């Protein structure tokens, strides 16, 4: 039992094969990774860490994130050779669907706002990369544990190539778009 | 409370009536 799962195997999968498709059961556009970096709102860590973004955001996607740390010298940013300033989380397979699907069509919404996802945003290999104004506002809220408006930036790497093959995969999977 | 609209005094003062100072 999985939610979207079917949506891709049952739907999208075929509409593509013949709209494109042909021959191999592999050269078909499909996702493989879903990473997401926070960065730490409009003010980074500080010796007194934050890690709430960790513990909280961790389970807003189901599974703790890692901790990245800067590099090189900063000067006018306040940082140094780094440590920390990161805290991101990748993850594929199951959790990839569950996180974006059980949140794609039910979560993303609610946040008081406009049209669809920024069109011209893909590149090659079709990966896109949106990036809400962070705003940790919904889904999985269960208030309290409210210190900063930290949210994130989502990265979605798919197989495919060009933008159509990629876009077709998302567009026909449940990704409202263009303004 | 003379400046508190939501009260007896508040209303009397302002010279008005309402949910908090009914016209008898």
């Amino acid at each position: 039992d999985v939610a979207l799962k079917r949506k891709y195997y049952e739907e999208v999968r075929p509409e593509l094969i013949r709209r494109f498709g042909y021959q191999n059961v592999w050269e078909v556009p499909r996702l493989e990774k879903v990473v997401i970096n926070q960065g730490l709102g409009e003010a980074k860590e500080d010796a007194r860490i934050l890690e709430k973004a960790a513990q909280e955001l961790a389970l807003i996607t189901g599974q703790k994130p890692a901790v990245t740390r800067a590099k090189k010298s900063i000067s006018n940013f306040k940082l140094r050779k780094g440590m920390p300033i990161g805290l991101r989380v990748t993850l594929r397979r199951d959790r990839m669907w569950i996180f974006l699907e059980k949140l794609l069509n039910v979560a993303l919404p609610r946040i008081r706002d406009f049209r669809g996802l920024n069109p011209n945003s893909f590149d090659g290999r079709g990966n896109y990369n949106l990036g809400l104004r962070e705003q940790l506002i919904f889904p999985e809220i269960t208030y309290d544990m409210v210190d900063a408006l930290r949210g994130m930036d989502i990265a979605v790497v798919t197989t495919a190539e060009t933008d159509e093959e990629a876009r077709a995969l998302l567009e026909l999977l449940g990704f409202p778009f263009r303004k | 409370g003379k400046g508190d609209r939501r009260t007896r005094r508040g209303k009397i003062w302002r010279g008005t009536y309402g949910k908090y100072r009914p016209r008898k």
Partner: protein, 71 residues
């Protein structure tokens, strides 16, 4: 895998003020919900929360359209 730390992983309920939705699989039971109440894809959405209360009914298509301005 990774023992410890990881959440709990358990199904619950995705309520919904407009019919059921996604099948439990996260870590939250209750929630405002609202899948979309109007999708949004292209149309079927843009419910533009501007509806001037009781539009029409007054000031409508009258006053005398263009008229015989042609003369």
């Amino acid at each position: 895998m990774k023992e410890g730390i990881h959440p709990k992983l358990v199904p619950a309920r995705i309520i919904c003020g407009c019919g059921n939705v996604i099948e439990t699989y996260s870590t939250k039971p209750e929630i405002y919900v609202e899948v979309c109440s109007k999708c949004h894809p292209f149309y079927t959405g843009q419910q533009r929360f501007v509806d001037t209360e009781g539009r029409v009914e007054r000031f409508q298509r009258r006053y005398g359209d263009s008229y015989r301005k042609g003369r």
